[PDB]
Amino acid sequence: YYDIDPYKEFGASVELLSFLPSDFFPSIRDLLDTASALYREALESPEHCSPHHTALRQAILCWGELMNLATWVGSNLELVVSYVNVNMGLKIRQLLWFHISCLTFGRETVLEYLVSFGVWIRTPPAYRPPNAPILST
Amino acid sequence: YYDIDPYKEFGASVELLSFLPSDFFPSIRDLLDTASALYREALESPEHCSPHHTALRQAILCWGELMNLATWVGSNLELVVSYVNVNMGLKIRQLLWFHISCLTFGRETVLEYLVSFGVWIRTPPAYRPPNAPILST
Amino acid sequence: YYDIDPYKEFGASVELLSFLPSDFFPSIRDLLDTASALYREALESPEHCSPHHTALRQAILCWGELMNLATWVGSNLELVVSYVNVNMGLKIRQLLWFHISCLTFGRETVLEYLVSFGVWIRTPPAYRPPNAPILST
Amino acid sequence: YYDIDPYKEFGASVELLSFLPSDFFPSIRDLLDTASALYREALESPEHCSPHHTALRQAILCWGELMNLATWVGSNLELVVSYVNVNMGLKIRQLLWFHISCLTFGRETVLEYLVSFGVWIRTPPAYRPPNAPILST
Amino acid sequence: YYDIDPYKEFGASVELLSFLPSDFFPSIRDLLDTASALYREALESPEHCSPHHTALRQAILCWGELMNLATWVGSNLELVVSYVNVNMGLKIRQLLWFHISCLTFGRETVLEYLVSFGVWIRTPPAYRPPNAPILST
Amino acid sequence: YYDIDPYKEFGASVELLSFLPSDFFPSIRDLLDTASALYREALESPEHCSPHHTALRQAILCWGELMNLATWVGSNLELVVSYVNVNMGLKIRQLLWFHISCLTFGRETVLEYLVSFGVWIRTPPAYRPPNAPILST
C-alpha cells in the first residue's frame, strides 16, 4: 500500500543507484562471505555504533527468513527458484553492496565513484577509456 | 547460513517476546494503519532521528516485498496465502510491535510493562488480580 | 538424621511458609521459565552476586537431576511418578517462589506480606475480607 | 531443559571432574559423617557465614530429600536401587567432596591439587610416582 | 574437532586470503629458498625477535616432516602423493607467503593490498582494469 | 632440505629430548584433551598472549592437519597406520607436552626437572630412587 526510499536517509535515491547496470553487481554468496568475514563481531556487537550496521542486520535477517521461506516452499511445492532468486537478487545485491562498500571509504567517495561510472557508461563505446571501475583507498 | 539475533537494543532476549502468547499481539491491518496514520510525515525525507525509525522502515519495506511476492504468486499460481502468514505474521508481529510501541513511552517503560505482564500471567489463574493492561504516559 | 532450616539464615522458617495453601503457588514450569527468561545472564554470569543467585543454581541442578531420576525410573519400568512429583512440588515451589520474589522487591517486603497472609488465613473464613492481600511494589 | 555449569564461579566443575576418575571419591556416608563430626553447629548458625556454606547446606538438604525418596521407594517398591546409589553418587560425591575439601585449606589449593593429580594420572605407568594423595596444611 | 584461525591474532581470516586464486601464489620451492637465503641468520638466531620468525620455524619443521611422511609412504609402496601434495600446497603457500610478505613492508600494507585484490576479483571480469593491482613499496 | 633446531630460543630441544626416553610421553589424545579442558577460550582470543601460545596453537593446527590427512588416507587406503601414529608421536608429543607443561610452572622449571630426570635415569638400577616424577607448584 506504501512505498519508501531505502536509500534516502543516507542521501541516495533509487534512480541514482539503479543507474548502474544490473550485471555489474556480483553474486550473493561471496557478498555474504565477505560481510561475515569482515564483521562477524561488529554486526553481533551489543552496541549499535552506526546506522549502517543496524540496517544491514535487519537486511541479513530478512534474507535468512526469506531463504527459510524458500526452503519451506520447496518442501511444500505440491523453475520455482529461477524466477524468484533473480527478483530478490536485483534488490538484495544492491542493498548489501551499498552498505558494506559505504562502510569503508567514508560513504561519500562511493557517490563520486558511482557518478563517474554513470558518466563513463553514458558515453558510447566509439571512444571510451579502458579503466572505468572503482579505485582502492 | 548463519544465526543472528534481530534485536540488540536490550531486546536481544527473544525469550521475552516468547513469554507473551502469540494471540496477544494485534493484527497486521491495525498496526499498519496506526503506523501509517501516525508517522506518514515522519517517515518521509527524514534524517537519522532515531535508529527505531530506520529499523521500522526497513521492516515495513521487507514486509512490502513479501506482499509483492505473495501478490505475484497469486497472479502466477499455476491456500497459497493461508499457510505463509502462519509463520510470516508471527515473525513480523514480534518484530515491529516492539518498535512501534517503544517509539513512544520512552523505550524503557515497555520493558517493565513486559516483565510485569509476564509475572501477572505466571501467577495462578485461581488467584489473579483483576487486570494488568498497558499504561501509557 | 538431623535436618537444617534453609530459610533460617535468610530470616524465615519452613513452617512459616507452610501456611500457604498448595493452590496459591503457580505451576513449576512457568516459574522455571520466568526465572530463566529473566536472569539467564545473571545465572550464567561468572559472578555469584547475591547468595540467592547461588542457591537457585543448585536448586535448578537438583531438580534437573530429579527429572533424570524420573526418566531412569520410566526406562526401567519398560501413580508412583505422580506421587513423587507432588511430593517435591510443594517444597520446590516454596523455595523457587521465595527466592524469585525476594530477588526483586528488596527481600524485606516478602516477610510482611507473608506474615499478613498468615494473619489472614488464621482468621476463620467468616470474618475475612472478600479478597486476600496481594503483593505490592 | 537446560545445561547449567554447577560452579563457574568456582573454576568449572565439568572438566575438573573429568580429570579425576569417578572411583576416587569415597563413600557418601563417610563424607556425611566426616562433615557432621566437624561442623554440626557451624551449619545451624543463623548467619550466612559464606556463600560456599549456603551451597553446601543446600546440597546436604538435597541429599536428605534424596534419601527420603529412596526410603519411600524402598517402602513402596511395588537391583535398580544399586544403580540409583551409584548414579547420583558421582555428582553428589563431587559436590560434597569439593565443598568439604575446599572449605578448609583456603579453597584455592584444591585447584592445583587436582591439576597435579591430572598430570600424575596422565603420566603412563612405565614411570609413575607411587602416590599423589591430598596434602594437609 | 574444533579449529582455530591462525591469522585472527595477526588481524586476518583464512577465508579472507581464500579469495586469491591458486595460480597467484608462486612455487613452494622458490618461496622456501627465498626465505632461507634471506633470513638464515635470523631463523638460526637464538632470539625469537618477531613472532612471525617463531611461526615460520614450526611451519618449516612441519613441512619437513611432511616430506618425511611422503618418503615413508613411498618406501612402504615398494596419484595419491600428488593429491596429498596439492592439498597442503594452497595452505602452506598462504601461510608462507603471508609471513614472508608481512615480515617486510611493515605488515600493514599487506592488508590493504589483499582487500583491494578482493574488491578487484569480486568485480565481474568485464568491468576490470587490464591488469590487477600489485604490491608496492 | 635443511636441519633446523626447533627451539634454540627455548633451550635446545634435541639433547633435552635425548635425555628423556621416548615412551615417557603420554598418549596424544590425552594431551589434546588435557589442553582442551584447560584453555579452549584462551587460545581463541584475538591477541598474541605469548609467543609460546602462538607456537602451540600453530602446533595444534598442524596436528589437526595431520589428522585430516590420516582420515583421508584411511578413507582412500587403496599396519602402516600404526607406524604413522608412532612415527610422529615422538616429535608431536615432545612439542605438545613441552608446550603444555612449560605454559604453567613458569617455563623454566621444566629445564631443571628434565635435567634431574636425566640424572635419575643415568643412575644404575643397583641403587635408584623409586620415582622421579613431575613436581606440581
Author numbering:
A (entry chain C), B (entry chain D), C (entry chain B), D (entry chain A), E (entry chain B), F (entry chain A): 49 to 126, 253 to 311
From the paper:
The N-terminal domain of HBcAg (aa 1–149) can form a dimer and be assembled into a capsid with an icosahedral symmetry composed of 180 (T = 3 state) or 240 (T = 4 state) subunits. HAF is composed of HBcAg, along with histidine and tyrosine tags for binding to gold ions, as well as a tandem repeat of the affibody for binding to EGFR. In the HAF sequence, the affibody was inserted between α4 and α5 of the HBcAg, the spike tip of the HBcAg. The affibody used in this study specifically binds to the extracellular domain of EGFR with a dissociation constant (KD) of 5.4 nM.
In order to solve this problem, we designed new HAF constructs with short linkers. Even if each linker was composed of two residues, it was confirmed that the construct could assemble into capsids. HAFS was self-assembled into a spherical capsid form, and the assembled HAFS was collected using sucrose gradient centrifugation. The 3D reconstruction structure of HAFS was also obtained, and the final resolution of HAFS (T = 4 state) was 4.41 Å. In the cryo-EM structure of HAFS, the capsid part of HAFS had the same size and shape as that of HAF or HBcAg. When the threshold was lowered, the affibody density protruding on both sides of the HAFS spike was clearly visible. Each spike is composed of HAFS dimer, and the affibody density protruding from the HAFS monomer consists of a pair of affibodies coming out of and back into the spike. In addition, at this threshold, only the affibody of HAFS, which consists of three protrusions in the three-fold axis, was observed. The full affibody density perfectly surrounds the HAFS. As a result, the affibody density extending from one spike to the left and right is more clearly visible. From the above results, it was confirmed that HAFS formed a spherical capsid and the affibody density was much more clearly visible than in the case of HAF.
